[PDB]
Amino acid sequence: MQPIQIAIVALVVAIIIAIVVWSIVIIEYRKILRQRKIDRLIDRLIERAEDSGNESEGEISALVELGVELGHHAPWDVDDL
């Protein structure tokens, strides 16, 4: 009378979404989304200047590995979750 299934892969997939789905709860409290505050970020860019600029990406992360590798420990762990 033991249970049987084609594969346990579906179960594992189910576990992943649980972690992703509950991650919002862990990082963000149900009582307050606080997410809408982030959406105001766009308005600030406009306030700072109509023409966006003074920003960079990719290159910045280039030095991160050098600093993190050199450093014994950094805020960002090996697990990117």
Side-chain angles (χ1 to χ4, degrees):
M1 316 301 173
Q2 294 297 306
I4 186 168
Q5 61 184 301
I6 292 169
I8 58 172
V9 172
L11 179 60
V12 171
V13 171
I15 295 301
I16 297 301
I17 55 170
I19 296 301
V20 172
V21 170
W22 199 253
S23 179
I24 292 169
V25 172
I26 292 169
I27 190 169
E28 183 64 20
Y29 291 91
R30 182 172 292 177
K31 290 187 288 188
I32 185 167
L33 291 170
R34 200 190 69 189
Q35 290 172 331
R36 291 171 293 177
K37 290 181 181 297
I38 292 169
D39 289 347
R40 298 181 67 81
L41 290 173
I42 292 169
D43 184 352
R44 290 187 294 172
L45 291 171
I46 292 169
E47 183 177 0
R48 290 172 63 189
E50 181 63 21
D51 182 354
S52 69
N54 302 120
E55 57 78 23
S56 180
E57 59 272 23
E59 186 281 332
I60 188 66
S61 67
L63 300 177
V64 171
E65 183 177 0
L66 284 54
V68 173
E69 181 62 21
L70 180 60
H72 288 80
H73 182 72
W76 179 87
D77 67 0
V78 299
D79 181 68
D80 66 1
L81 180 60

